[PDB]
């Protein structure tokens, strides 16, 4: 994969020119796009900017995020050929930093369950995950150094784990969702894909300009709390194998690891994730549901058809439970620096299954808002397996530092 | 002015038909548009829908709110002829309930301070206020029974007070802001204009389907707390005349009224509103600021230029102060049912002043998120003056009930 931090350092000392770096990505995309299909639109004439921390850095954008110079089709036939007037704030954050928007990456229709045609870089017979399938696949295949994705029902952490890339879903709202096609305003969050934790750090620093992302270095003797999210049921063998491998590597690196239970209130928040999601989606996608019902991707269409009756009453109740979860979850971070858990149920599903994978081990954290980071651990049958680092809300930097720590630990 | 509730009743019983109701607004609009200039575009072909509680109800929409059959120009030349593909969720809430979208009403550029050409129905030589100038004036001119507006730096309460109409800014996030051009995601809220509180109630019931808005009736002996927002400086005499008139009417009507001082924290929250507004506006309008800078209306453009230096640190600090303010404000409501305060600095400013009026007495509440309702009180020199009823967050229904009680109280 291409390292953003690496390119940065070389472009900074003058070893690599921005134009050469951008030409690099175009070639890397050309070399695998025909077999992976991660791009809805590759702008072959996209060029490097002459200044800024991200000059020479190519970035792929999940297609529910507005771009002014390229179409934003939402991964749906309903928005075929649709062209937004402006670039979404998140795209402008990259551009203002000198980045090059190299193209739009595939996304599941409206960021839901319906599979795209993108294939897993490690085995074209498997799913790259969702909802931001293209961004994960593109980074995993070494096409681009960075990519923006989104999440609602799940997290960028799952497709990242499937494709073996690093990724982070920042604290809720840190990255604006303006210009990001709404599925659920309570959940919708923007995330980043990269080669390693360090690349995510540099990427967020340039985008937000927040000092918390400046000077990040691997953590030391982290206090890790292992949670297996029992409420979501047992994971597949491959996933557990990856968790055990990560714990062992971390311990051998000086980290204190302990198994922890998640408070009952937190278990409840996980349960009502669907209520919040679907109730809000009915309002957010009202025009689509009313005017273009049969044009909505099958799986998403069905989920909506089945939740038309959700009441404002049970919705308010769900949010109430959600908040109680956030409070008590915070309490869990009074005795630990970061949590360590599964990134997915296991290895990426075969495409034949027509599934982007179950988001059950990702949904809670997206609802709570905590920053999560995927750390590739091992591979089973050639398919990547990862684990995710989760820190207290607003502690994004610490999440990245511990993830960086885990990476070095796994490298031994 | 036209009463939504009135229209509902008459149409329900059969006294009036939906087609006739709509025809009347088309006529009303045609009768004074050349005098008021409230509509960006009037869809003369709009007809009544067949079923629904709002069948026969013509509704005007502030032009930063997406509509799929009419342009959405954001009150800016940058978006001239811009045509969204979808209707915003709030527009869908209306359509689904059977309403008729009769047109788009003028809005200050990006819902900021730049004056539109719209004039005050009570006095063409005066401003109708902002940011939703057209919605307020159109309702004030008796063109339509309902209109949607937005608020960021102020509140629909101010233009409503300027034009002598009722209005409510529901609890933050009750009405989705998807498809509503973002100015500040922490403040952006949708509101309603109508003849009286009852009209707003029925309007919200139909839009949200929330039972709290069903069967609302005037409150009895409400516990009112009077706040004069001294942190906002001196108010104009006409404004105090109205507040006093309201207080006297309320007392005569059986309400218990006491003067109270808001906590320092609340004064602080009011102070940092601009910080949250402007820091976010730079992210929310990045594309416009970077690519079409000189095209941004003068006043907004100036407010942005002077704030390019706002840092994420002071922004975070500003939001800290905001939260404290909300926490301590809620405590105030343990003594009274609602708060009563000024809706504006005084009577509507002359158009010659090139100002939509100072939002200083509105901004605090929009940031806190509490539901606010405007209650017309009297007129000085022919210009309307109102007061606003504010309730605990989530207590929209009681704010309306209390506003209704006040209306009857003033009616003597």
From TrEMBL, chains A, B:
Modified residues (Cysteine sulfenic acid (-SOH)): 155
Annotated Polar residues bias: 115-126
Record-level Gene Ontology MF annotations: catalytic activity
Domain Amidase: 42-398
Segments for region (Disordered): 113-134
Residues where Cysteine sulfinic acid (-SO2H) is found: 155
InterPro entries (UniProt xref): Amidase, Amidase_dom, AS_sf
Family: Belongs to the amidase family.
Protein name: Malonamidase E2
Organism: Bradyrhizobium japonicum
């Amino acid at each position: 994969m291409i390292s953003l931090a690496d390119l940065q350092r070389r472009i900074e000392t003058g070893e690599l020119s921005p134009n050469a770096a951008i030409a690099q990505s175009h070639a890397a995309i050309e070399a695998r796009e025909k077999e992976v299909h991660a791009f809805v639109r590759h702008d072959k004439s996209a060029r490097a900017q002459a200044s800024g921390p991200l000059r020479g850095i190519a970035v792929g954008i999940a297609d529910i995020i507005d771009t002014a110079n390229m179409p934003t089709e939402m991964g749906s036939e309903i928005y075929r050929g649709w062209q937004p007037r402006s670039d979404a704030p998140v795209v402008m954050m990259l551009k203002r930093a000198g980045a090059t928007i190299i193209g739009k990456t595939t996304t599941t229709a409206f960021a839901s369950r319906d599979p795209t045609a993108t294939l897993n870089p490690h085995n074209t017979g498997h799913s790259p995950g969702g909802s931001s399938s293209g961004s994960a696949a593109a980074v995993g295949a070494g096409m681009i150094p960075l990519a923006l994705g989104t999440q609602t029902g799940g997290s960028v952490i799952r497709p990242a784990a499937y494709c073996g890339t690093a990724a982070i879903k920042p604290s809720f709202r840190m990255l604006p969702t303006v210009g990001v096609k709404c599925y659920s305003w309570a959940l919708d969050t923007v995330g980043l894909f990269g080669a390693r934790a360090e690349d995510l750090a540099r990427g967020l620093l340039a985008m937000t300009g927040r000092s918390e992302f400046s000077g990040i270095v691997p953590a030391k003797a982290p206090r890790i709390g292992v949670v297996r999210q029992e409420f979501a049921g047992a994971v597949e063998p491959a996933a557990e194998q990856g968790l055990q491998a990560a714990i062992k590597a971390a311990e051998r690196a000086g980290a204190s690891v302990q198994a922890i239970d998640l408070p009952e209130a937190v278990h409840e928040a996980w349960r009502i994730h669907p209520i919040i999601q679907d109730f809000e989606a009915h309002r957010a996608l009202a025009w689509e549901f009313s005017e273009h019902h049969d044009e909505i991707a099958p799986m998403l269409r069905a989920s909506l058809d089945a939740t038309v009756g959700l009441t404002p009453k049970e919705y308010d109740e769900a949010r109430r439970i959600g908040r109680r979860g956030r409070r008590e979850l915070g309490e869990v971070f009074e005795g630990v620096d970061v949590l360590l858990t599964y990134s997915a149920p296991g290895t990426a599903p075969a495409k034949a299954l027509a599934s982007t994978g179950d988001p059950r081990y990702n949904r809670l954290w997206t609802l709570m808002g905590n920053p999560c980071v995927n750390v590739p651990v091992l591979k089973v049958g050639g398919l990547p397996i990862g684990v995710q680092v989760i820190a207290r809300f607003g502690n994004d930097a610490h999440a990245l530092a511990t993830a960086w720590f885990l990476e070095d630990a796994l490298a031994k």
